[PDB]
């Protein structure tokens, strides 16, 4: 559990990074 | 914790969905 409390924080952090990275990739590819 | 075990399951599922989307975008931007 000690690693679980942080586990969700690890996937939650990567998510924000993936989103910010996706918002930058979508603006380069998904670009209008 | 009951919601934690799933929390990581939701962040882990979104990660593969995000990486699966970034893996395609990266192949266009992060192109080696």
UniProtKB/Swiss-Prot annotation, chains A, B:
Organism name: Saccharomyces cerevisiae (strain ATCC 204508 / S288c) (Baker's yeast)
Family designation: Belongs to the bZIP family. GCN4 subfamily.
Reported function: Master transcriptional regulator that mediates the response to amino acid starvation. Binds variations of the DNA sequence 5'-ATGA[CG]TCAT-3' in canonical nucleosome-depleted 5'-positioned promoters, and also within coding sequences and 3' non-coding regions. During nutrient starvation (low or poor amino acid, carbon or purine sources), it activates genes required for amino acid biosynthesis and transport, autophagy, cofactor biosynthesis and transport, mitochondrial transport, and additional downstream transcription factors.
Subunit field text: Homodimer. Each subunit binds overlapping and non-identical half-sites that flank the central CG base-pair in the pseudo-palindromic motif 5'-ATGA[CG]TCAT-3'. Interacts with the mediator tail; the interaction with GAL11/MED15 is direct. Interacts with the SAGA histone acetyltransferase complex. Interacts with the SWI/SNF chromatin remodeling complex.
Induction: Translation is induced by amino acid or purine starvation, or during growth in low or poor carbon sources. Translational repression during nutrient-rich conditions is dependent on four uORFs (upstream open reading frames) present in the 5'-UTR of the mRNA; these promote ribosome dissociation. Translational induction occurs in conditions reducing translation machinery efficiency, leading to ribosomes scanning over the uORFs, and increased translation of the mRNA. The rapid translational induction is followed by transcriptional induction at later time-points, independently of the uORF sequences.
Shown segment, full-protein numbering: 265 to 281 of 281
Protein name per UniProt: General control transcription factor GCN4
Null mutant phenotype: Abolishes recruitment of the mediator complex to the upstream activating sequence (UAS) of amino-acid starvation responsive genes. Decreases RNA level of genes involved in amino acid biosynthesis and cofactor biosynthesis during amino acid starvation or methyl methanesulfonate stress. Growth dependent on amino acid supplementation. Sensitive to amino acid starvation. Sensitive to purine starvation. Decreases cellular glycogen levels during glucose starvation.
PTM comment, free text: Phosphorylated by the cyclin-CDK PCL5-PHO85.
Subcellular location: Nucleus
Notes on the domains: Residues 89 to 100 and 106 to 125 define the N-terminal activation domain (NTAD) and the central acidic activation domain (CAAD) respectively, which can function independently to promote high-level transcription of the target genes.
